[PDB]
């Protein structure tokens, strides 16, 4: 058909109501009276009564103002019946479009936006982002397009133009330079959005930016030069602690100190760090020792764990140390294999005039010499002059003496001012003299009767050679009660044989030898005889 165009109507209209929109006519009215009515939402349906028609003229009206924001369009159905009561025309659809008007102010997405950036970054860096909206049209008008802006950053210091915002997108960026967490950490700037691309109505928001941290700062010592005293030897011990103040953020690696000495003399120092006021705690690496050095001039520089965000001054601490003195024990010089001395020494004679030395050249402390180790008592010392003399009777020949030795240990004490011990061994070579003289091996026989065979006997000397070289056998009172002497060819033994057919048991034979001579006297080597033929038998 020839329909009927949609009807545009403005919003928030205002004048004298009613307002005729249009007029409709059924031509089938030649016959009876026609009754015009109309139906739909806004008509008889909810919102009832916005539009109504004059049953007799065919006029359509808007009865009151409208807000497209509420309902932006309506569709209606129109009718025409006869007085008799019958419909005449197939109904007719009707449309109305509600044209937008700038009745709406915009509104920010949130009531407050927050942001953060680091202090050392470069100009032209994107920080935050902000939103807002207008409910009016924005597809055929500007009643709903906004334009963003900024008008007041607080801390109007260092300067007041650190940022800008993209008018269309509302994004903010760092424009200037001079950000420092250490002086001004959080800005509060006021934003506004406007109707018709900055032309219409405006509103406010608030965005707040916190500033991350940077290693803008270096560490600073609170003393620059310290001093402490120290002892030579127990040690590995705490000398002095140090103080400092970095200014970036505390629990952070831009706040933790790292040290080191420049030069470690004997490399006898270690230094650690501590999460207190991360003071510098210095200590001794390997004890000290001395009388060698009293002075210690060393320097320690301090850094952070992480590198610096800028060239900065490295700052050292210069420190002086002094070693207190402890006084140590003295010592005999050697451990003496000294005196190759003979057995004939006169009880009270100079053996070893000895001396001991003591470390501490503070030496105005003497000591006393004491002896100590010990198989039995011979020797003697002058305690205030360390003089070892030889008292007593010695005898290389016999008991304690093991290999050609006699080892003895002695002491010495550090007095004068405190304490001390000195353990020193002393081996002294004893010597030989020909003391003893020759002696027979077996002392009792068992001779036989009829024809006894030679009674083997031998010789032994306690002395050391030559002193036991060859012999000379001799038979004293009974050199004839019949007894005849004899030597083995290979030196050592002697052959003892009677020369008479003598008696039934129990009787001695006086013996007498010599080796350089010395002559011993020996003696009786008794002789038990019991009935027989010729071989030395078990007796009775
Ligand atoms: C930003 O927020 C802080 C915290 O309240 C406030 O003290 C300051 O005045 C605001 N503006 C700037 C630029 O710091
Ligand atoms: C020396 O060391 C002591 C240790 O107690 C310290 O108090 C002092 O500051 C250091 N410097 C000087 C010059 O004494
Ligand atoms: C660190 O020590 C320096 C030296 O006096 C001082 O100026 C600074 O204020 C100290 N740091 C802090 C946080 O006080
Ligand atoms: C202190 O500094 C030294 C030197 O680098 C380091 O080895 C040590 O681990 C530090 N102490 C601590 C607790 O970090
Ligand atoms: C530390 O060493 C320096 C360098 O010679 C010296 O001036 C200072 O006296 C020493 N001790 C003290 C107490 O500073
Ligand atoms: C001699 O030194 C040795 C070796 O230590 C030791 O066993 C002995 O007791 C010391 N005295 C004598 C008399 O041998
Ligand atoms: C010296 O050392 C000895 C070790 O035999 C020890 O018994 C003594 O206590 C020490 N003397 C002193 C005066 O400290
Ligand atoms: C010295 O005397 C000390 C103190 O008893 C002792 O421990 C040490 O064994 C002794 N000997 C030596 C050779 O120092
Ligand atoms: C040997 O026997 C005699 C005879 O009785 C006795 O007098 C003597 O003591 C015994 N031994 C020695 C070594 O004299
Ligand atoms: C010093 O002492 C600390 C504590 O035991 C140890 O961990 C470190 O290895 C030593 N040496 C240094 C150079 O720090
Ligand atoms: C000083 O030395 C430290 C390393 O010990 C270094 O990191 C720092 O950059 C130096 N100072 C300067 C101005 O380069
Ligand atoms: C510490 O002080 C000494 C003496 O004044 C100096 O040699 C050293 O360089 C100083 N360290 C610093 C960082 O000034
Ligand atoms: C530490 O400071 C002293 C004096 O200020 C300086 O001479 C020295 O070069 C510094 N050490 C380091 C490693 O920077
Ligand atoms: C005494 O000192 C000597 C060093 O000549 C050593 O060989 C010996 O073990 C020491 N004896 C003791 C008990 O100290
Ligand atoms: C005696 O001398 C020998 C040879 O020098 C030596 O090796 C030994 O130790 C000493 N004493 C003993 C019991 O062997
Ligand atoms: Ca409206
Ligand atoms: Ca509107
Ligand atoms: Ca608007
Ligand atoms: Ca800074
Ligand atoms: Ca720092
Ligand atoms: Ca910082
Ligand atoms: Ca010493
Ligand atoms: Ca000392
Ligand atoms: Ca001493
Ligand atoms: Ca002897
Ligand atoms: Ca001897
Ligand atoms: Ca002999």
DSSP codes joined into one string, 52-84: EE-TTT-EEEE-S---TTT--EEEEEEEEEESS
406 C-alpha to center of ligand 6: Å?
6
Q: Enumerate residues 6+ apart whose C-beta is below 8 A from 370.
A: 381, 383, 410, 411, 412, 413
Sign of CA dihedral 151, 152, 153, 159: positive
Domain span holding position 13: 1-101
Instruction: Based on the fold, state whether residues 265 and 294 are members of the same structural domain.
Output: yes
Among 66, 101, 136, where does a domain finish?
Answer: 101
Contact 127, 163 (CB under 8 A): yes
> CB 353: neighbour CB atoms within 10 A?
11
Distance (Å, rounded) from C-alpha 534 to C-alpha 56?
Answer: 190
Instruction: Based on the fold, state whether residues 88 and 186 are members of the same structural domain.
Output: no
361 C-alpha to center of ligand 2: Å?
27
| Cβ 297 under 6 angstroms from ligand 5 | yes
Ligand 13, atom 6, residue with closest C-alpha: 316
Ligand 25 (single-atom ion) residues, CB below 5 Å = 395, 397, 435
Among 47, 74, 101, where does a domain finish?
Answer: 101
Which of 331, 413, 418, 425 best tests ligand 7's pocket when mutated (most atoms within 8 Å of CB)?
A: 413
- Nearest by Cα to 168 from 193, 147, 192, 137: 147
Instruction: Based on the fold, state whether residues 323 and 333 are members of the same structural domain.
Output: no
Ligand 11, atom 4, residue with closest C-alpha: 314
**Half-sphere exposure of 237 toward its Cβ, with a 13 Å CA cutoff?**
11
Ligand 19 (single-atom ion) residues, CB below 5 Å = 180, 182, 216
Distance (Å, rounded) from C-alpha 386 to C-alpha 333?
Answer: 12
336 C-alpha to center of ligand 6: Å?
13
Instruction: Based on the fold, state whether residues 380 and 446 are members of the same structural domain.
Output: no
Among 169, 186, 213, where does a domain finish?
Answer: 213
| Cα 441 → chain centroid | 78
Q: Which ligand ends up closest to the CA of 460? A: 27
Instruction: Based on the fold, state whether residues 116 and 75 are members of the same structural domain.
Output: no
Q: Which residues line ligand 6 (CB under 6 A)?
A: 375, 400, 402, 405-407
Q: How was this structure determined?
A: X-ray
298 C-alpha to center of ligand 13: Å?
12
> What tokens were used for 476?
């004293």
Instruction: Based on the fold, state whether residues 318 and 348 are members of the same structural domain.
Output: no
Instruction: Based on the fold, state whether residues 174 and 202 are members of the same structural domain.
Output: yes
Instruction: Based on the fold, state whether residues 221 and 323 are members of the same structural domain.
Output: yes
| For residue 39, cis peptide bond before it (omega within 30 degrees of 0) | no
Ligand 9, atom 4, residue with closest C-alpha: 507
Distance (Å, rounded) from C-alpha 246 to C-alpha 305?
Answer: 12
| Cβ 417 under 6 angstroms from ligand 7 | no
The string over 152-182, giving b where at least 16 C-beta atoms fall within 10 Å of a residue's C-beta and e elsewhere, is: ebeeeeeeeebbebeeeebebbbeeeebebe
What are φ and ψ of residue 30, in 5° steps?
Answer: -60, -35
Distance (Å, rounded) from C-alpha 352 to C-alpha 155?
Answer: 94
Instruction: Based on the fold, state whether residues 231 and 312 are members of the same structural domain.
Output: yes
Contact 103, 77 (CB under 8 A): no
Output the domain CATH number for residue 493: 2.60.40.60
Q: Name residue, tokens 């919102």.
A: 47
- Nearest by Cα to 166 from 198, 133, 209: 198
Distance (Å, rounded) from C-alpha 232 to C-alpha 220?
Answer: 32
User: In Å, what resolution does this model reach?
Assistant: 3.1
Instruction: Based on the fold, state whether residues 79 and 109 are members of the same structural domain.
Output: no
Sign of CA dihedral 155, 161, 164, 167: positive
| Cβ 277 under 6 angstroms from ligand 12 | no
314 C-alpha to center of ligand 11: Å?
5
Instruction: Based on the fold, state whether residues 91 and 115 are members of the same structural domain.
Output: no
Q: Which ligand ends up closest to the CA of 356? A: 24
Instruction: Based on the fold, state whether residues 355 and 303 are members of the same structural domain.
Output: no
Contact 528, 474 (CB under 8 A): no
For residue 247, the ligand 3 atom closest to its alpha carbon is: 13
Which of 331, 334, 335 best tests ligand 14's pocket when mutated (most atoms within 8 Å of CB)?
A: 335
DSSP 8-state code for residue 121? P
Q: How many residues does the chain have?
A: 540
- Exposed, middle or buried, 243 (CB in 10 Å: 0-12/13-18/19+)? middle
What's the angle, vertex CA 364, arms to CA 358 and CA 370, rounded to 5? 50
What's the number of domains the chain is made of?
A: 5
């Amino acid at each position: 058909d020839w329909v009927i165009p949609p009807i545009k109507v403005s919003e928030n209209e205002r004048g004298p109501f009613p307002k005729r929109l249009v007029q409709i006519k059924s031509n089938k009215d030649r016959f009876n009276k026609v009754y015009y009515s109309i139906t739909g939402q806004g008509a008889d349906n909810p919102p009832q009564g916005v539009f109504r028609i004059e049953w007799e003229t065919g006029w359509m009206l808007v009865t009151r103002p409208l807000d497209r924001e509420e309902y932006d369009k309506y569709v209606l159905s129109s009718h025409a019946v006869s007085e008799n009561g019958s419909p005449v025309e197939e109904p007719m659809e009707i449309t109305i479009n509600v044209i937008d008007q700038n009745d709406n102010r915009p509104k920010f997405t949130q009531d407050v936006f927050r942001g953060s950036v680091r202090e050392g970054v470069q100009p032209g860096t994107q920080v935050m982002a902000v939103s807002a909206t207008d409910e009016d049209d924005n597809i055929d008008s500007l009643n709903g397009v906004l334009s963003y802006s900024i008008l007041k950053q607080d801390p109007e210091e260092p300067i007041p133009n650190l940022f800008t915002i993209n008018r269309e997108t509302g994004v903010i960026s760092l424009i200037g330079t001079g950000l420092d967490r250490e002086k001004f950490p959080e800005y509060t700037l006021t934003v506004q959005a406007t109707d018709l691309e900055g032309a219409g109505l405006s509103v406010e928001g608030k965005a707040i930016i916190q500033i991350t941290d940077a290693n803008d700062n270096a560490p600073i010592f609170d003393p620059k030069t310290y001093t402490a005293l120290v002892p030579e030897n127990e040690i590995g011990f705490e000398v002095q602690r140090l103080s400092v103040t970095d200014l970036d953020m505390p629990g952070t690696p831009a706040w933790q100190a790292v040290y080191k000495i420049r030069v470690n003399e004997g490399g006898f120092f270690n230094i650690t760090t501590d999460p207190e006021s991360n003071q510098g705690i210095l200590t001794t690496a390997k004890g000290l020792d001395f009388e060698l050095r009293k002075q210690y001039v060393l320097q320690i520089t301090v850094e952070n764990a992480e590198p610096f965000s800028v060239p900065l001054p490295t700052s050292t601490a210069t420190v002086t140390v002094t070693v207190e003195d402890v006084n140590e024990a003295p010592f005999f010089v050697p451990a003496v294999s000294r005196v190759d001395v003979s057995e004939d020494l006169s009880r009270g004679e100079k053996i070893i005039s000895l001396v001991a030395q003591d470390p501490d050249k503070q030496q105005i402390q003497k000591l006393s010499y004491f002896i100590g180790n010990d198989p039995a008592r011979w020797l003697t010392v002058n305690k205030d002059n360390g003089i070892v003399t030889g008292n007593g009777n010695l005898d290389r020949e016999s008991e304690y003496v093991k290999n050609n030795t006699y080892t003895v240990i002695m002491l010495v004490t550090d007095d004068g001012v405190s304490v001390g011990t000195g353990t020193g061994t002393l081996i002294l070579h004893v010597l030989d003299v020909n003391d003893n003289g020759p002696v027979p091996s077996p002392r009792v026989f068992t001779m036989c009767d009829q024809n006894p065979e030679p009674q083997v006997l031998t010789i032994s000397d306690a002395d050391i050679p030559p002193n036991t070289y060859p012999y000379k056998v001799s038979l004293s009172h009974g050199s004839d009660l019949t007894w005849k002497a004899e030597l083995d060819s290979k030196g050592t033994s002697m052959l003892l044989s009677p020369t008479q057919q003598l008696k039934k048991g129990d009787y001695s034979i006086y013996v007498l030898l010599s080796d350089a001579q010395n002559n011993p006297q020996l003696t009786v080597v008794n002789a038990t005889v019991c009935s027989c033929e010729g071989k030395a038998i078990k007796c009775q």
